[PDB]
Design a protein around this ligand. Structure first.
Ligand SMILES: Cc1nc(NC(=O)NCCOCCC(C)(C)C)sc1C#Cc1ccncc1
Length: 842
């Protein structure tokens, strides 16, 4: 209503990248009702959260301090360098010392509580009643053997985060369901079309009726009643009326929810703008209609049937039911299996791992059965009590489940995750919103309240939602209605940082797309393209870009002015921008960021998230495989950013040092580069230990994912011997890369065993074992990222690579040999595929 409240909605639309106050693409108030419906949990969180802790966002974890990291604390007391101006005197504190206790041990050891421990060079705070061992920044320093540098700083003002003042039933109706297909209208040789109407409940198709084929014209009228066998009483909440135009080839689709957001049966006249098939995918389930009215095929339908929706086993069969529960998520159930799970549903409820299969075997098109399922769900004693299995929880949030009650018990288990884990699974929990039948949901409300509770979760939430909105027309309506709901609770300070970030990304994306236009595809980096970049960049800095911004992939870091003398264009075919920015904290080395158009960085983000999940799985088994999970955020269509890792070099560039652009690869090349880049033999004998652990980790990780066969120009290594892979936005043969240059560093010529190669295969095989223990988790993370992120998704063979790879249904002893067989494939191949990878240049 306020004249300035209208200017707030245009700031929101600039941050979101979509106008939520738009009704040109809706046939009901589903999104408007969701906007108002979210005010309640937004305000409950904004009110619930403590302001002094929300402002300083302490990054803690309640997981035990790992064994390898404990070895670094040999004195049961670690060093903390506290700095204030000139002062820079260290302190020895016990790992059980709260930052409050370490405050009394700094003031009493000097000659008041209004000072906090802030890390040097970042906006990261060691505050709150949590032991110093549980702070992430402390654990990060103990991993990379770095010294703890803090500052006696003034705490931020919690008032900076201020917020702006914000009839019959179905079960009585015994008639059959019907829908009149009036016609189809395309704006614009000699084929036929027919329409197919389906009653769907997630994946499962309850009923199906088609029209008679009629010639392919601009307007095709039918005016026909399609009668279905399903009674109106039997329609479940979340039932979708999928209308498809077939040429026998699917050309267009559009969904419409039979039961609306108010439990009412949908009736009336509807003119639906349809999506074209690109010439399985989460986008196929979307309730949103095609916004492009000018170029899309339309379908007009009619309904009127108000009507509202109301709210002891033998050993043999036990052995069959247990065998079924044991099988992996992708093992398909048969009618025999489904029937056995249902009849013995009370036995199945006693095992929580049998939840996805028990609910996958429910007759959803039968009111009577869904009513039994809801009574069955009330006996949730086992479920509530049970330990949180995130892998199992996520199965219940995928495409196979449209049930609000089924999906909600899963969100109830997610409320147990601490911030630390909510960050690991955030990308995936965000995509799972695509599978929710309705806009307002338990999951949406869950992501909102956690983002609003923690500024680190909030920052990442923003970038993930802003990402899908900027490259998904099927879901931008839903995700923007959730991003507005968040942005209206993060508080003024966040709303300012996001504006500066969005602004910088927008300008640099323009320059990335402009430099790509200038430098031709079949063209190297000339003097024209390099000087045009420095010219374009000077005009941005001189009055059109913020003097400061938080780094999207690492928010604790604030980047400042552009070091234009250090920026350049990369030699890749996609011509990425290598940019360097000066650090914005005085507390002169820059931040390196790569901007890139051309590759799908959602696939990059989805693999990088899985590497943090994998190294977490290992951390619990007291393993550390030094994976370098560099930052990378997708910002729109094929465009996005990548973190430049300090003093790291490509493996292919290391060999084309001894001898340049040629296929004669030496083994000693990498072994020399490591010693040449090491000051003392102590630092070189460390680089081989960082190489053995990091190398073994990337071998197992890429193998389980099916991205082990990579060109060595996409494999980098640091001067400190930390190997890492880059550019995952792509996907004879090889399982993973273990080329003879790497073996030389471990001590083996080939077909030999050295003491370090022995160390390598020991951790290598123990890491495979560790991941095999979390088979269902990896299967679901990959299975879900293919439903949403990877658009070339095969719901048959693509999804099942990880099944064969993860040694399903096999003993742990065979696995040790099988993994070592794949090690020996890389021994006999040597440089066979690496040579053919170099040959892919011409
Ligand atoms: C992840 C990553 N790190 C690198 N590090 C590096 O070049 N260091 C060289 C020296 O430090 C730079 C110096 C300073 C800026 C730190 C001050 S390049 C790279 C990549 C990539 C990529 C390309 C295409 N698609 C996806 C990913």
């Amino acid at each position: 209503a306020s004249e300035e409240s209208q200017a707030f909605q245009r700031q929101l639309t600039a941050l979101i990248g979509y106008d939520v106050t738009d009704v040109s693409n809706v046939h009901d108030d589903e999104l408007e009702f969701t906007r108002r419906g979210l005010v309640t949990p937004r305000m409950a969180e904004v009110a619930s959260r403590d302001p002094k802790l929300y402002a300083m966002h302490p990054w803690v974890t309640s997981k035990p301090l790992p064994e390898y990291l404990w070895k670094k604390i040999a004195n049961n007391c670690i060093f903390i360098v506290i700095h204030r101006s000139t002062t820079s005197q260290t302190i020895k504190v016990s790992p059980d010392d709260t930052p409050g206790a370490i405050l009394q041990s700094f003031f009493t050891k000097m000659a008041e509580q209004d000072f906090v421990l802030r890390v040097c060079g970042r906006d990261e705070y060691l505050v709150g009643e949590t032991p110093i061992k549980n702070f992430q920044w402390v654990r990060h320093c103990l991993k990379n053997g770095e010294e703890i540098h803090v500052v006696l700083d003034t705490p931020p003002d919690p008032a900076l985060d201020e917020v702006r003042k914000e009839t019959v039933s179905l079960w009585d109706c015994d008639r059959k369901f019907r829908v009149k297909i009036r016609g189809i209208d395309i704006p614009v040789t000699d084929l036929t079309v027919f329409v197919e109407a389906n009653i769907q409940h997630g994946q499962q198709v309850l009923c199906q009726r088609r029209t008679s084929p009629k010639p392919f014209t601009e307007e095709v009228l039918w005016n026909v009643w399609l009668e279905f066998s399903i009674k109106i009483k039997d329609l479940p909440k979340g039932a979708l009326l999928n209308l498809q135009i077939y040429c026998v080839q699917l050309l267009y689709y559009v969904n419409l929810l039979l039961i609306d957001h108010r439990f009412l049966l949908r009736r009336g006249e509807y003119v639906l703008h349809m999506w074209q098939i690109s010439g399985f995918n989460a986008d196929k389930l979307t309730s949103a209609t095609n916004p492009d009215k000018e170029n899309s095929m339309s379908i007009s339908i009619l309904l009127d049937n108000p009507i509202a929706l109301p709210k002891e086993m033998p050993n043999q069969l036990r052995k069959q039911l247990e065998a079924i529960i044991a099988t992996d998520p992708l093992n398909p159930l048969t009618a025999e299996d489904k029937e056995l799970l249902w009849h013995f549903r009370y036995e199945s409820l006693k095992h929580p791992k049998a939840y996805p299969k028990l609910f996958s075997s429910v007759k959803w098109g039968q009111q009577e059965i869904v009513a039994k399922t809801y009574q069955l769900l009330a006996r949730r004693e086992v479920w509530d009590q049970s330990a949180l299995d995130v892998g199992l929880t996520m199965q219940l949030l995928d495409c196979n489940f449209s049930d609000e009650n089924v999906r909600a018990i899963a969100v109830q288990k997610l409320e147990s995750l601490e911030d630390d884990d909510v960050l690991h699974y955030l990308l995936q929990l965000v995509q799972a919103v695509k599978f929710e039948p309705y806009h307002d949901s338990a999951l949406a409300r869950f992501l909102l309240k956690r983002g609003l509770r923690n500024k680190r979760i909030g920052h990442f939430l923003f970038w993930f939602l802003r990402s899908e909105i900027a490259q998904s027309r099927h879901y931008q309506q839903r995700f923007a209605v959730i991003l507005e709901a968040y942005l209206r609770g993060c508080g003024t300070a966040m709303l300012h940082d996001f504006t500066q970030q969005v602004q910088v990304i927008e300008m640099l994306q323009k320059v990335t797309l402009d430099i790509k236009s200038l430098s031709a595809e079949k063209y190297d980096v000339s003097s024209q393209v390099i000087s045009q970049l420095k010219q374009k960049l000077e005009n941005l800095q001189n009055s059109q870009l913020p003097e400061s911004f938080r780094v999207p992939y690492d928010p604790g870091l604030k980047a400042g002015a552009l070091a234009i003398e250090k920026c350049k264009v990369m030699a890749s075919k996609k011509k990425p921008l290598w940019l360097e920015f000066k650090c914005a904290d005085p507390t002169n080395e820059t931040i390196g960021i790569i901007f890139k158009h051309g590759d799908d960085l959602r696939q990059d983000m989805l693999i990088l998230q899985i590497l943090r999940i994998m190294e977490s799985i290992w951390e619990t088994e007291s393993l550390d495989l030094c994976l370098l999970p560099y930052g990378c955020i997708s910002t729109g269509d094929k465009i996005g950013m990548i973190e430049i890792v300090k003093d790291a070099t490509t493996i292919a560039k290391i060999q084309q040092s001894t001898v340049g652009n040629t296929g004669a690869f030496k083994d000693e090349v990498l072994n020399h580069w490591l010693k040449e880049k090491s000051p003392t033999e102590e630092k070189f004998q460390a680089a081989v230990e960082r190489f053995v652990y990091s190398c073994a980790g990337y071998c197992v990780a890429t193998f389980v994912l099916g991205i082990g066969d990579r060109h060595n120009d996409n494999i980098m290594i640091t001067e400190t011997g930390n190997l890492f892979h880059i550019d995952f936005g792509h996907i004879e043969r090889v399982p993973f890369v273990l080329t003879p240059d790497f073996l030389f560093v471990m001590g083996t010529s080939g077909k030999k065993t050295s003491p370090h190669f022995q160390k390598f295969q020991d951790i290598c095989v123990k890491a495979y074992l560790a991941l095999r223990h979390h088979t269902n988790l990896l299967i679901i993370l990959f299975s879900m990222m293919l439903m949403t992120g990877m658009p070339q998704l095969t719901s048959k063979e693509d999804i099942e690579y990880i099944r064969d790879a993860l040694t399903v249904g096999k003993n742990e002893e065979d696995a040790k040999k099988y993994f070592l067989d794949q090690i020996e494939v890389c021994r006999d191949k040597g440089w066979t595929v690496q040579f053919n990878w170099f040959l892919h240049l011409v």
